[PDB]
Structure formats: C-alpha cells, structure tokens
Symmetry: D3
C-alpha cells in the first residue's frame, strides 16, 4: 500500500490502471485492430513499469460502446476467442496479469438474446482465470443481459481478486459480497460517462474503506460521438486513502503497489474499523459485560435484506411505491422503455 515508484517487491502487487481512450468502432475487423493496440500498450507499459503485475483496462475499451444493435450482435465476442488470445499473448510477453473487457460477450442463445457485458482476468501464462458478467447493467440506455454471480480468484502473488463493472459499483452490496467471499482487491472497470464524476470518485474510496479492501478503478476517457468519459482511474488502499488517481486525460496511467501482508495484518488485527469482522459480531463488548457470551450478535437486523432474500417480488413492490412502478417515465421517455 504505497505510491510513487515503478518497482514492486515480493510483498507488493504492482497494479497499473489505464484511462483508455474510448474507441468508436463498428466492425469485427476494427475491434480486432483495437485489441491489438491494447496488447501493444500492455507490452510498452511493462517496459516502463518493471514492477507491473496487473494491468487494468476500462469497460468497453476493446469494442467501445456498440450503440447500433446490429453492430452489437455482429461484434459480440466468444470467450475464449480471438480477442482474449490477443490479450493473453501480451500478458505472457509482458509477464503480467490483466483485466480486459468484452462488450458484448455472446449470450448462450446468441443472437436471440442480449450479449453480456464481461470482464476477464488473464494470468501471466495467458490463462483466463476469472470471467465476470455485469450484474447491474447501466439501464436504461445500455442493453446488456444481466449476469448473476461474483467470483474471487487467487491473483498475482496470491492477492485475492474480484472483478466488477461500472454501474455495479454504485451498489454497496456488490463490494460487500466480493469482500465477504475473501476479495483483497476489487477491480472496477468502467466506461463511466459524465455527468456523475465526483460521485464515482468518492464511491470507490468509500467502498474501499467500508469493505477493508484494495480497490482499482480503470475508467475510459474522451468523447465517442455520444458520451464523454471522465477518466479518474485510481488505485485506493484498504484504509480508504487514494494511492494514485488519474485526471480526465486520454491514456493516463496510474500505478501503485498493494501489500499482501498489510491487508492480511489489518484484517487480523484491526479493531475499531474492522468492518467485515464487526458486522457479524455486533455489540460484543456490551454482550460480554451483560453476561451473554463473547461473540456479539451475528443475526441480520435489516428487514430490507430479509425481505429481498425471502420475497424479492415484495421488495420490488415496496421500492416501486417509493420510486415508480414502470421502468420508464413519461416525463423523460425513451424508445423501447415502457412507462405510464
């Protein structure tokens, strides 16, 4: 957990994040060309960052956003496939792990159902060791089929990694779920468009703190014909302090070293802000002093979560009374999104 150098040691994972300029592409050949540019960039960066162990690219960095449905279908990737092979070679050549974005990944029922929005973690042997499908797509504008599982993967030097995508990060639950599965680094890849710049910068930090986890964010930059992406890729410590943060500049890079031993020393020995421990041992001091044993309380005291787990339709109905009952709103209509 330290910032400023280009090295990495047996104790630290050198993480690089990339403010990748958002492509505006249309064909499979253009996607492949751009995959190769990413691969070239990984290899170049390694030559400047000898400590680099993990390189992180934004959501949509390979295809851009395929606004046109037909082009979306025609360019949706297989995984493994030609794109991931192009990425795998660069990971082997540069002896790094990497996180890359396939938007879309073909649905099992392609081309008759929406593609997934997907991330892969590829190791320094070029092997895909985690494939994560975005659980909370950025509706209404974006049309990806929602995934349903988070994953934790042993990463470089043993650092436990989970991947999440863009809009997922707005939802504290996902960051909780990954940390509770053991994640030591949550990697958030995004093509996060203006407007919500300060809010997204703040959310990553707050999640790092709340879940006692390293966080790495790679966000796209530039204007792509529709949206302007605000960069601010960053790596953040498990104590909520930024290591390094990019600005809005195209193809900015940040790089930081995250200590394996520091996060484990902290999860073991921290007390007042050992949030993962504390949430499931509530009021331990009190129960000890009241003669009720020394574990505190584990029971979930939040009816929202009880209800969502036992009766998701009721949780939904509940929320619709607070918000609205249709996915669309007649005051701001959007074609193909129903309202009224």
């Amino acid at each position: 957990m330290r910032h400023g150098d280009i090295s990495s040691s047996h104790d630290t994972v050198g993480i690089a994040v990339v403010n990748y300029k958002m492509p505006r592409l249309h064909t499979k050949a253009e996607v492949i060309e751009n995959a190769k540019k990413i691969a070239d960039m990984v290899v170049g960066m390694k030559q400047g960052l000898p400590g680099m162990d993990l390189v992180v690219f934004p959501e949509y960095s390979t295809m851009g956003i395929m606004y046109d449905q037909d082009e979306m279908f025609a360019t949706a990737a297989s995984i493994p496939g030609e794109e991931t092979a192009i990425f795998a070679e660069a990971c082997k050549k540069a002896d790094t792990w990497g996180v890359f974005s396939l938007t879309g990944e073909k649905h099992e029922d392609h081309p008759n159902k929406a593609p997934y929005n997907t991330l892969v973690l590829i190791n320094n042997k070029g092997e895909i060791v985690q494939k994560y499908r975005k659980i909370i797509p950025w509706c209404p504008i974006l049309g990806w089929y929602p995934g349903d599982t988070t994953y934790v993967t042993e990463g470089p030097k043993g650092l436990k990694i989970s991947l999440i995508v863009c809009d997922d990060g707005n939802y504290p639950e996902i960051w909780r779920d990954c940390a509770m599965k053991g994640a030591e680094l949550i990697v958030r890849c995004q093509g996060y468009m203006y407007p919500a710049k300060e809010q997204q910068i703040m959310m990553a930090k707050a999640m790092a703190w709340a879940n006692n986890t390293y966080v790495a964010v790679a966000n796209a930059t530039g204007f792509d014909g529709v949206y302007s992406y605000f960069g601010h890729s960053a790596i953040i410590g498990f104590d909520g302090r930024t290591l390094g943060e990019c600005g809005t500049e195209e193809n900015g890079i940040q790089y930081a070293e995250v200590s394996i031993s520091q996060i484990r020393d902290f999860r073991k020995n921290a007390q007042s802000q050992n949030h993962l421990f504390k949430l499931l041992h509530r009021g331990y001091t009190g129960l000890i002093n009241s003669g009720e044993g020394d574990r505190g309380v584990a029971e979930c005291p939040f009816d929202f979560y009880r209800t969502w787990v036992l009766d998701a339709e009721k949780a939904r109905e509940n929320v619709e009374k607070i918000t609205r009952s249709t996915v669309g709103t007649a005051e701001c209509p959007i074609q193909g999104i129903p309202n009224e």
Copy 2:
C-alpha cells in the same frame, strides 16, 4: 436542497446540525444541567434561524461518554424521562423538531445489562415520535447493548426521517434499510473521535448518493479527557453534494433547506442513478430486448446476503476465517475483550 439562507419555505425543511462540544460529566445532576444547556441552545438558535424545523445534536451530547461503568449505570436515562422533558420543552418553545442523544438509556433489565445508546426524535409539540437504539455499537471500547430495528417517521412538513448512530454509518446496509423503508432524510448523530475524519466525511456523502437520500450528520467536537472529536457536522443532498459542512470548531452550526418536492420528483423521474429503483429491476433494457418482459430482475444475486439471512452463524464463521476468530487480538489486548 439549497444552502445559504436562514429561511425555510412550505417546500423545504430547515435543518440545523450542531458541532456540540463534548461534555465530561460524572453525575445525574451534571447531566441534567447540560440537558438544560442544550435546551437553551435550541431556543437561541431558533432566534437566529427562523426557518429552522429540525435541530440535530451529536451522540453523547447530553451525558458525554460515561467511561466509568458505575457512573454509566447511575446516569442511564429513562425514556421518556427528565432529560427528554427538558428537550421537549425547548422543541415546543422554539417550535422545532429535534434529535437528542441518551447515552445510556436504561436496559429493560437495568442495572444488570448494559444500557442502550439511543436517539429520540421529538416533534414541535414535544412528543417523542421515534426512539432508535444503536444497532452497531463502536466496539471494542464502547459497551452499549445493541438495538435491533430501524424506523421511519413522518417528520416536519411530512419529510420521512430515520435515525442512525455513529458507527452504524460505516455499514452501508443500515442506510439501505432506512431508504428502502421510505426514509427521505437519514440523520446520523455521532461522537466520532479522531482518527477516521476524512473517511467519515466521505462515507456520509457516498451514502447520500448511493441511497438517493438527504443526510444530516451532527458530530461532537473538543477533547474530553480521552478522545478528541473532529466535528464536520453536515447536511448533504440526495445527489451526493454537500449542502453545508462545519469544520472542527466547538459549537459550530450548519443549516440547510431540504426540498420535499425535489427528493420525490427525483425518486419518481430519475433514471440512470435511481439506485433504489434499479437494484430491484436489474437489466431491464436487456430483458425487454431479449423478449423477457419489462420488469428486469429482482432476485438477490449476492450470496453473502442470502447466507447472512438464512444462516448467520455460517456468515460469521466465514468472516472469522478472513479476519480472526476471537473478538480481541493478542497483538493489541484490551481488558475484558478475550483473544488467542
């Protein structure tokens, strides 16, 4: 949702938060004296803030922190009781609602079990309309018996209010639970000691954003013999932007107007960052375009929450493997907190 004036209108609730100087008290008579000082302060403030509809005092602002167990028991309050009556009179006199702290509130089995750490919302008729007992006490150092329920109360001008205390706020779940019950303002009262200053400033903002809720934070200030409290009381909009924020100064005050109609207009019509709606309608655009109906997906896709709800002991066991198995740590022992 606007900042700078001392007025309030039919549409806005004028919220004042107080950087109350932490008392260092020892006897019931001193507590009562200090309750009266708070009451005097409410009445004075009203004369300078004619728009004031809600006044918020920090956790521990009435008793301070009763470090000595015997004094803790001797000073624990009934609710209703003499303290709340003193507060109620000031709310009637100043025609404001108020949030006040009783630390401790007598346990049902007092003096044989730890007191609760409690907040009350008192209306402008002097009536207690919400009593909230802290669900996640600041263990290990503090010994309060944990509460188990959140509440939503119709407040001034119809604004829906939930109360939470200090350490609760580190845990996104609580802020979710209150908003999912309908809360429009989550009031976080704290006696939040250094060190974790920037982290707590950031957490309130991030929670306001993540839960599309107004947030008001009153935090104590000064040194009390043990801890130094860092102030930064604040009121924050539902879009994650601070309205006004205090510094670390003793008896700082901030004041902002929060629009009833703006938060409801937003919860109804916002789309990309209507987080409460979106969490229970995941991938709606995708499912529409894939021929699967127009509601998106409501189902909880996070195994942590499923497991915590169905088998809290397993969730606990899981977390102990990531952290530690005893509430204490031999590397930093604390008397009465077991370890090894």
Copy 3:
C-alpha cells in the same frame, strides 16, 4: 438543482455544456464543415442524455478565433444564415434548445467595421429566440465590435435565459443586469484561454451566488496555434454550489437538471441572502424599528454608478487616473494599440 442523472422532469431543465475543442480554421467551407460537426454532436449527445433540454457550446466553437483579419472578414456570418440553419436542424432533430457562437457576425456596415462576437439561443423548433452581441470584448488582443444590450428570453419549460460571452463575465454588472431583468439562468459561453483558470472558475460561482441565478458555462479546450483553453465548463446552482464541472479535457461534457420551481421558491421566500430583493430594500428592519415605514431604502448610495450613468466621460477620466490614460502601455506594446 441536482446532479448526477441523465433524465429531466417537468420541473427541471436538463442542461448540457460542452468543453468543445477549439478549431483552427481559415475558410468559409471549413467553418461550415465544423458547424456540421457541432450539429452531429448535439444529435449524438441527445441519444445519451434523454433529459437534455438545452445544449451550450463555447464562444468561438464554430469558427475558432480568426486571428487573420482578412479571414475574419471572409468568414463572418449572417444571422440567420447557413450556420444557424445547420444548428437549427440539429435542435429540431434532437428536440433541444441550443446556444451557439458566431464569431464574427457581420456588422451592419460589413466589411468596413469590425464584426460582432455573437451568441444565439435557438429553440427546439429551430427558431432563433435570442441574439446577443458581446458587450465587453477581450481587448487588447481581440477586435470585435462591442454590442450594447442584454436580453431575457423564455426558454425551455419556461426557464428565463440570458446569454453573455466570455470577458463579459469578469464584470459583475452584467450578471446583475440580466438577473434584474428576470434571468433565471445566465449562460456564459467562452473561449477562455489560460492563464486565468482558477479566477474564471471562481467568478461564475460567485456570480451565481451574488445574483441568486443558475449559471451554465461552456468553455473551449485544446491549443489552437496561439492559445490553450482550459475547459472547466460547469453548471452552478443559484446558491453558489457547483452542480457539475468539467476538467481541461477536450470535448468533455457536463449535464445537470435545474429546477424551475426551486429558483422561484427561493426568490420568493429566501430572506438573509435574497440579494436581488435586499439591494433595493436596504436596512428594512432598522427603518421599521425607527418609525420610517416598512420598505427599507431603494436609493443608489454608490457614487460610481451615479457618475457612470450621468457622466460616463468623467467616470472614464476618473479611472484613467487610477490606471492609465491610453489603451496601450509602452512597457508592453501591441501593434495597433496606441500608448505613451
């Protein structure tokens, strides 16, 4: 007055501002090509911002700065003309209002007098509803003929709009004049070059506060052969708080919703910082309590403004004694600007 979403509601005007990359152009055909790029950008943005009701482009965004006098004359536009028609079509197609820059607009005596520097507000039917000529050109370097009038126009959803340009904004008087005519949003379009970056960021906010008005700023970016433009396009509330702000990035975009009902509720009911009201009712409490009626004092107590209005030549003479008597200075000469 809220920030973060892409929607807009019956109550809010969705304003987008653009950090448009400064062109370096030379011919009428190149200007027309670039007008079409702007139009294309409006249509694209709308597809990502369904709430968008108003889109704002920087001063010089259409022609760039025509440094060469002959090219300046050859490219000066008529209004209405081919450029505005190109803009009008994009406003109709995207069902938005827009603010566009013509630099120059032909003088009535073209080509024998300097062109104006001009902005137009075009409605969602493609009709020009306000044409504003810059009153305080950025002398000495820039050569535009000064305009002489501010305007207030009923805009989208009834929001009252005034336009101002760049250097105008340094002068509090202009922002006062527009607000005193009824303006609810003052739109400041600029091609504001380094050096004065922080000063210009601060000025917009301070003016929003001082005049209880929404403010939207679109500023150019990039290097154009002569000047580097620093972006920081922004939308600011009437309480002086930024909604959203760009960085220095080329073709950044920000987007915010400004509430019609909030600004009117505020101008009606605010008291301590109802600056527009207060300036013309000075010392009301005092005069009431002194038995002098209940209106306060309206009379202008500032001799500078009395003198400027009655005897502008004397105001000028006065200022020349404090500054200098010639437009140029021999310590930093500039060709065609006299000094000594």
Copy 4:
C-alpha cells in the same frame, strides 16, 4: 503581495486579521472590559509581528451582537468615545493602524432611531481617519440604521484604504465603488454566521479579482448563544489569489505583506484583466480598427443601473415582481417584519 514572513518593508504594508472570538455581552462596563482585551491583543500581536502596520478586527468584536434592544441602546457608542480612545492608545503603543467595530454607534437622533453599525480606521498616532457606517445591514435579523457613503483614506505607507462591513460584501457594487474611488485595499469586517461559509470565502476572492484590489477580511468565531461564526479571516491579492486564510479557530490570526508598488504597477500596465480600466473603454481594439477613435466606449450599457440611478422606485418595483413585494414572507414569519 507575499505571504509567510512576520516582517514588512518600505514597499509592503503588513496586514494582520483576527478571527476574534465573538463576545456575549450585556452592559457598558462589559463592553469597556472587552475593548481593553482587544487593545491588549493588538499590543501583544505587535510583539510577535514586527512588520505589522494594520490590524483588523471583526464586526461586533467590541460589543458582540446586542440581541436585546434595550441593551443595544444602552451600549451604543459615541465616536470618538471611550472605546475608540482605548483602541487609539493600543495603536499608538504598538505603532500600528487599526480597524475596529462599534455596534452600535449612536444615531444622531439616539435613542429614538436605530444605531449605526460602524467601523473606524485609526492611525498609528491614534487619530480616527475613516468612519464607515454599514450601507446594507444583514436584514431581517439585524436592526441597524443603514449608512449611505463609502470612503477612501490614505493609510499606512500611503496604501489607499476603504472599509466595508459584512453583508455589504455580498453586493459587488460596493467593492466596485470603493475601487473606482481609488481604494487599493478593501477591508471587510464581519461577524458572519454560519450557514454561508464557502460562499463568503469565495466572494472575497472573486471581488479582489474583479476589482484588481487587495482585500482583507476579519471574521468572528465561536458560538454566542444564537449564532456560530465561521472565521476564515484572510488577506487576498489583487490577482484573486489568497495570501493567507484562517480556519474556524477562535482567535486565529493571519498576516501578509501587500506591496504598494505591485498594485500600482499592475493598475498601470496590466491589459487583459485590467478590469477597472476595461469597463470604461469597452471594445477599444474594435473601435480603433473600425475607424472610430482610440478610447473604446465609456457609456453604461446596463439598463438596471440606469434605472436604479434615475428611478429607484421603479427598480424596486421591478425587483419585487421577481422576488416578493413585502419585506417578510408568510412562509417564514419573523416578529416585526411585515408580510402577505
């Protein structure tokens, strides 16, 4: 214009500003006691700041705010009087100039009309050389009789000084008026209560920039029974950059050196942001190049100011249509302030 040292030179005026803790006083004897504390503080500070040439205390620093009308009348000062004599002795003893606050100063018709809120500049010989009565009292809450004139006084080392008070500063006109009379430093003394902290910090800087003037702000701190004052006393350069700024701390001090020769060199030779010059020579480059002489345009092109000067009642009527027609509002009533 430089910050960091305790010295001052023949070229620089050493200005100290004081975050004076707001008194809560009630009697003439208590006011005199507190005047003596201020005097003692001036003498002490000088021993630590040998460069100090000007010391600035907040509005209300001598009496506090006399909330009770009878006490307000009983404590209103003569000028010259016993308070100013107490101040004058400290200025002579410490060989400094000073700015002190008398709230109230007796009306000419005392006790039958409201006192003024007044500042004095006292030279290093103990002579009162400027007495300024607040032109825009902080209505509705505060009841001072409004003054009607600004002043410019030759100060230490020849530095031209104008004084303004608190709420005046929200109004750009006043800062313009003083600079247009020749002011090189505008001293703003305030007892500026929360809420509007960031807005007031920003306003001073923006005014320094807009009027090419040094600015010094002394603001009170602490809680006085009614209001909490937020400090942030500061000295700001004529280029809009803060020299030094206090926090919210009681009896903070800042100190900076302001160069006589730098501000005069700037007012003489600055060009693009010589705002005082530019406002009365608009479009000079354009008129030169259009064959219309080399002075630009001086004429006031702002109808608000024309109307306010010629027909203040009409300006008032105009503003009442945009805001409200009565000084009070029924949605937030205040006793003795009429509404409906």
Copy 5:
C-alpha cells in the same frame, strides 16, 4: 502505513500526535501543574487508543513560550528533572513512548547563556533515550541557544527515530541528515504560529517524500497573548501521502499505524524514487552502458555544500551578498537585533 483504526500490531507503531493548546505560563509551579496535565492526557489517550506506542507533544507544550527573559531563566528545566519525571511516569503508566518539550533547558553556563530548546524521547520504561537541542532556533523573535547534533534512536518495536524542532523543518538538510543516519520516523515538534500554515503543511509532506521517511508533526493551537498557532498535527507516510491530519482545533489528536516492514521493504526494493540510494549512485544506468562500472557516481557535485563544509565563513559571506549583511533590517527593526 495505514490510517483509521485505534489498534496497532506487531508490525505497526501506533503514533498519536497532539494539537496541544498553547499555555500562557509564568512560574515554575504553573509549569509543573501543566506538565501534570500533559501526563494526565497521555494516560487518558491510551485508554482510547490501545494501539498507541508513541505520543507526541508540541514544542512549548510544557512551558508555553516564556516571552519574559527573567521568567525564561527562572523556569528553564534540568534534564532529567522534575518535568521529565512527571512525563516518565505517564509513559510507564500508559506503556507508551513519548516526545516532550522543555523550553528552555538550562545551558551548561545557566543563567549566563540562553537556554536550549529541547525535546526528549522517553521510552515505555520511563527512560530518556534521546535529547535533542534545536539546531535552527526561530530567529529573530526567539532567543534559544542553538544545538549542534542530530540523533537516531531505536524506538518502539525497533522503529528508528529522530527528533527535530519547528523551524528546523524548513531546512531540507536536517531531514536528510536524520534519514542518512538511518531514521525511519522523523518527529517534528512545533509551536508554529500563523502566518505560514499551508507552507508548513506542505513541507512535512515533501520531506517525507524526499527522504523516504515516516514523518509525525505535533503542532500547538490557540492564541497565547502574542501568537496564534495553527495546529495541523499529522502523520505522513514515506511515500509523501498524509495518513491523518488535524485541523486548527485545540487539543485535536490524530493517530496512525506506521509499518516497520513496509519502510524497510521499500528502502530495499524501491528503484525510481529510492532517493536515499539514488543520491549517492547518480547515473548508474548511464555509467554501466558507457563501460564505467556499476555503482554510478557518489561524488558531491554541489559547490554550496563543498564550500559550506570547507569554508563556512565564505558560504556566509556569499549568502549575505544575496540577502543582507546584518541579522536585522532597518526597514523592520527589532530591539536587540542590530542592523544598517
């Protein structure tokens, strides 16, 4: 190197720094009373910070600043003496190390030569293990006899500590000297008065970075009759990032954990910003590639340092030509400081 918790582990030293309110004292009995208050504060803090291993108090925190020469002499301490015994007991009782300030410490020729300004490091057995005399007193105002040596002491958990005082920190040389002797933490104790607040905040961070060292700063707060002290006590990592920072508040506290293993892992394995290594192996890559061996260059290439070491009088003469030749200046005279 992590921030937020109250614990500490076998790997981390828990450092607390105190924004101690500056005393205004006059007699030996008052000094002893205040020493006891400090001791009481150490013991109290420990009860809230169980991880605390090192507690740091500001320069002047024991005596305040003895402005009066006679009182300065009458209150100058022996070390060891009654004050240090009072401190030692609190370190033993709270099982912490501590850094305390004696201003003055008796000169060897007391009372005929100025006292030193001195710091002591006292271990958790109450033993004085380092006594540092300020090398660069804050002339002209302060009169302490200059010390001449820096020290490095094995501290808690083996962490290597050097002490420096206030004005020393403005001079990069001192921080270099301590790090080059092996220091892992440089503790800077100060009673650092306004004006130079931002400059001092920045200097500590920059020194932490430049010397790859932990830094802890304890600075006084409050007004003492002469000076106002600006707090901002802090602990900073060896990568130049703040762990935690106080504001200007009286008796603020910050607390952070500094990893023994992280700083040693970094000094061993960092490459591009291993400044201590790099300064004495300049151009290693170049010399390797030019066939000149693999150590780079160690030789001092800075004539200032060569000259200062070999001929300090010449270095002095040199500097006097750039600045002035007498310690005082006639433009800002100070009694007992000669000029002209």
Copy 6:
C-alpha cells in the same frame, strides 16, 4: 509575482510554461520536424502573450524519449546545432528567451559513451547563454550520462536563472545549490511520467518556499507508447504559493509575471522565513543575548554533508546499509541493471 494577465512590465518577467505533448519519434528528420513545430509554437504563443519574456518547454519535448539505444545515438544532438538554431530563430522572431531540451546531447566521446540529457537557455538574440546537463538522471530506466555542475545566468530583465531537469528536483540539494549561487528563478523541465503526480506538484512548491526562489516547471503530457506524462506545468512564487498551474491536458500553457523587485526586496528584508540567510546565521538572537557576537553560527552541523564532501565512498557505503548494496534488486529485475 502575480497571475492572470497576458502583459508584463519593466518590473516583471512574463514566464510561459508548456504542457508539451510528448513526441514518439525515431529519426533525425522527425526530430527536426518536431523542433520546427516547437518554434512555430513559440511564435504563436507570443502573439497571444505580448508580455512573454521566457518560454519553457519540457524535458524530451524535442526528441521524445529515445527508448531504442541505436536511435538514441543516431539522434543525439550537437550544441550548438541544427535544433538549437531552429529554436534560436523562434526566440529572435518572438523576441523571447527560451528553454529547450536536447535528449540526448552527444557525449564528448560519442558514440562510445551515453549522451547527456541537456537544457539550454537561449536569449532573445538567439544566443545560448546556459547549457545544463542533468546531474541526477532518472535511473534505472533512463541511461543518460550524468552532468556535474549547476549554473546561474542573467536572464530577461536581469532575472537570475538556473536550469534543472526532472529527477534532479526530487533532491533538495540541487535547488539549494542554485539559490545559493544567486538564482532568482529555478526552471525545472521534465518529462515526468505517472505515477508520482501529487508528489512532484508538491515538491516544486516546497522548494520554492524552502529556497525563497521563483520556480517554473514545464512537464510533458500524453502517452508515448511506454509512459503517460501528467502535465501540471506551473509557475510558483518565492513564498511557496502557486501562480498558475496546468492540468494534465495536452499543450496546456500557463503564464505568470514574476517581479524582479519583489524577490530582491524579500531576500533583503524578510526575517522569520529568510531561509537562505538563516541557514548560515543560526541562533543569532541567542548568541547576541549570550554575549557571543551578532552573526549567529555558520558552521555545518550536519554530519551527512561533512561526510559526503570529505569521503563520498563512506557516505555511499552508509546509504547502502539503509537501502541495498547493488543498483538493482532481484525482487524486480531489469536487464542490464545488476543485482544480488
């Protein structure tokens, strides 16, 4: 020392710094093409900045970084040579001084020893008046032969200038050496890659403060195939306050005026923070009051500097025990950098 305008006066040097986009070049013809682009940019900028007296370009701005050794040798420049002639013409044409980068400059033994990394100061007559070779190259990655001397040159309007390059700036010694030779402005030209962005922004400011010198920093921007450069070119006052600062944007420009008379007035008359004076007159007040004459102490009390000057090999050995003994580390190996 003032910021915001485009003018300059007899008293001020107008300094422009350029966030030059990092080239990716390979041949001598491409280098010459890019030299011409720089020249064109100087001439253009002058037309927008009539006050400009000094223009500053980043390290590597002419050649980019020649990663390939053969291309490095083939493109290394003579000085004077064709590149400098191209620069000299633009300085004459635009009547400015300039600082330009030649990376590499041919070694005396070219092509058999590594080129230098070099800067030149070229006057407004096109004459090279200072040539500085980087003393501390950015090892390990970069291979330049280390230089050994700093220089001070009379610059525009008599302003004394020293040049330093990139990595040099991390080392306080260099900034000391230049100021102690008389430098009034230290110009730091860098191609400073991410990661260490905030650290480098802070270092320049801290050095400006510590050495009572103006500082100008020009840093490259963009991605060059290997590294992403973070801009933040800036000009900083001798009191440690930024005048103006760029962001990360390609071809950003900042411009500020630095007063000749202000820095000399300050070095003459400042007292508490006259660091250059104070370092060689330590404890003057104390020695005066102790009867030991009125010069304070000049002697170097820092053993590191004594040892480095007398026995550089011992200083080296000392540092290797604190860091490591080989230039490389086996935990992060780099080809051609030995370790173990």
